[PDB]
Amino acid sequence: EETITIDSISNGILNNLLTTLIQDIVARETTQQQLLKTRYPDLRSYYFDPNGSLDINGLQKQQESSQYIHCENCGRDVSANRLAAHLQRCLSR
């Protein structure tokens, strides 16, 4: 047997505190991932690009210049990057 001291009791107290907190965190982690994996068997992580060019689906920035939105107020296709300016002039009606 070891000779129990204030230091050994104290390490023991800290270790209880430490292990309980680790075991709480890990439990929360393992239950979450088990849920995600059971819920979505084809679950894929979000893409990460060290080059900082690709999105969470591994795709490049789409060109907003060449996108359009159908405006319900006038029934026109409007270039997306122009929707704000268009609204100010269209909603005036």
């Binding site: 709480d24 994996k37 990057n81």
Partner: protein
């Protein structure tokens, strides 16, 4: 169908009375964990019945009897075999453990959503789990003509736990008197949440309808393109809509002097104490919805707060001091970066200011205990005061950060996020000692 379910809980769940009894006990244990003062909780849910130690690892509350057993000395395991009680609840988190599987039962929605046990069959048939793609609400907002000063803010709102809970709880939808997303801001925001986290219907654009509705609302009510100003604009609209939906706004006001139960005023508001000079001669308390800080010649956010909190400059003393009388649940900070000079020119301050992942506010409250906030949102600005671009960064569960650059949503390391030139910071309360 790779990952399986604990066959033991499944077996017991073949009998209805047994199913209801397990769920009742789980709710019960969880209820107790949420309504026990610290000492009681330690002595009664974290005290092992065998070795009598506190916190000897996780301590488990048995489903079938009153015993609590510890992990570190294997004392619940011993209980499971010698008595046949194999299900225990971790008193730190309410998770249910199986000691035959030697694993947590985490993938049965009924157990996860036990509060709904009594209604489970309706719930299961009429609602579905989130789709993989929408589960985290991630989706970009197209820049429709200098509207990143709006989209950057919206992203942070949409990933704010409090606002997200508020919208998904149907609070506003249940009391709104306009019921139109093309006229009511709150309705417009509800629709964005709907698009981002659920399904709105049955190019190249997707999930922009709510945002478009919000622009339409904006126009009906009616430049500088300051994201901070739009933060203030939108939180104001949420409040006004709350007040509009009350049956008795007038009398509630004089009821409790200028006090509000709306989402904005119960989450984002605090108060500053302005003190004159060992007692304080005079004291004015003034609410705030965010703190606007000066950054000139400073390198760190603590230094900014320190400055804001400084003493400056009679019966018994005179010295002036600004401090926090009341803190908010979500603390929002603006680092002042836009100067508007008298000659009409504008000057942008690109100084990097270090800001921490966790902010301790104790030194700024008028011994104060550690009061620790978690950084969950950054809005950053690049370029000139008027012809600039805003980008949002948000932290969601698990610690992953995401950068929202108009329609592009990308993942980013925390290390890189921390290098950003912060303009607005969103901190959520995490620990109060």
């Amino acid at each position: 169908a790779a990952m399986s379910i604990c066959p033991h809980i499944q077996q017991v769940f073949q009998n209805e009375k047994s199913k209801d009894g397990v769920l009742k006990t789980c709710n019960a244990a969880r209820y107790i964990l949420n309504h026990s003062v610290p000492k009681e909780k330690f002595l009664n849910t974290m005290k092992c019945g065998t070795c009598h130690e506190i916190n000897s690892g996780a301590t488990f509350m048995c489903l079938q009897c009153g015993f609590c057993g510890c992990w570190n000395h294997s004392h619940f395991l011993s209980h499971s075999k010698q008595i046949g009680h194999i299900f225990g609840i971790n008193s730190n988190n309410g998770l249910l453990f199986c000691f035959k599987c030697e694993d947590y039962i985490g993938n049965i929605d009924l157990i996860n959503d036990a509060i709904l046990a009594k209604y489970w069959d309706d719930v299961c048939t009429k609602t579905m789990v989130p789709s993989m793609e929408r589960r985290d609400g991630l989706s970009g907002l197209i820049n429709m003509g200098s509207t990143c000063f709006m989209s950057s803010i919206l992203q942070c709102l949409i990933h704010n736990p409090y606002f997200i809970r508020h919208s998904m709880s149907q609070i506003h939808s249940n009391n709104c008197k306009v019921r139109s997303p093309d006229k009511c801001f709150s309705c417009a925001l509800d629709k964005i949440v709907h698009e981002l986290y659920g399904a709105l219907n049955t190019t190249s654009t997707n999930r922009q309808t709510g945002f478009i509705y919000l622009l339409t609302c904006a126009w009906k009510i009616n430049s500088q393109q300051d994201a901070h100003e739009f933060w203030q604009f939108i939180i104001n609209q949420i409040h006004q809509s709350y007040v509009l939906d009350l049956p008795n706004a007038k009398e509630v006001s004089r009821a409790n002097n200028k006090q509000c139960e709306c989402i904005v005023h119960t989450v984002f508001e605090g108060s500053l104490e302005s003190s004159i000079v060992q007692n304080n001669s005079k004291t004015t308390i003034d609410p705030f919805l965010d703190l606007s800080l000066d950054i000139k010649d400073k390198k760190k956010l603590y230094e900014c707060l320190d400055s804001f909190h400084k003493k400056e400059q009679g019966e018994c003393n005179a010295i002036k001091q600004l401090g926090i009388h009341k803190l908010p649940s979500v603390l929002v900070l603006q680092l002042k970066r836009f100067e508007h000079l008298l000659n009409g020119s504008n000057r942008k301050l690109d100084d990097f200011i270090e800001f921490p992942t966790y902010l301790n506010m104790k030194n700024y409250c008028s011994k104060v205990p550690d009061i620790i906030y978690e950084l969950i949102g950054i809005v950053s600005h690049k370029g000139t005061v008027n012809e600039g671009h805003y980008i949002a960064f948000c932290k969601i569960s698990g610690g992953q950060w995401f950068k929202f650059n108009d329609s592009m949503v990308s993942s980013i390391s925390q290390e890189e996020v921390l290098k950003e030139q912060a303009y607005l910071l969103f901190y959520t309360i995490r620990q109060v000692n």
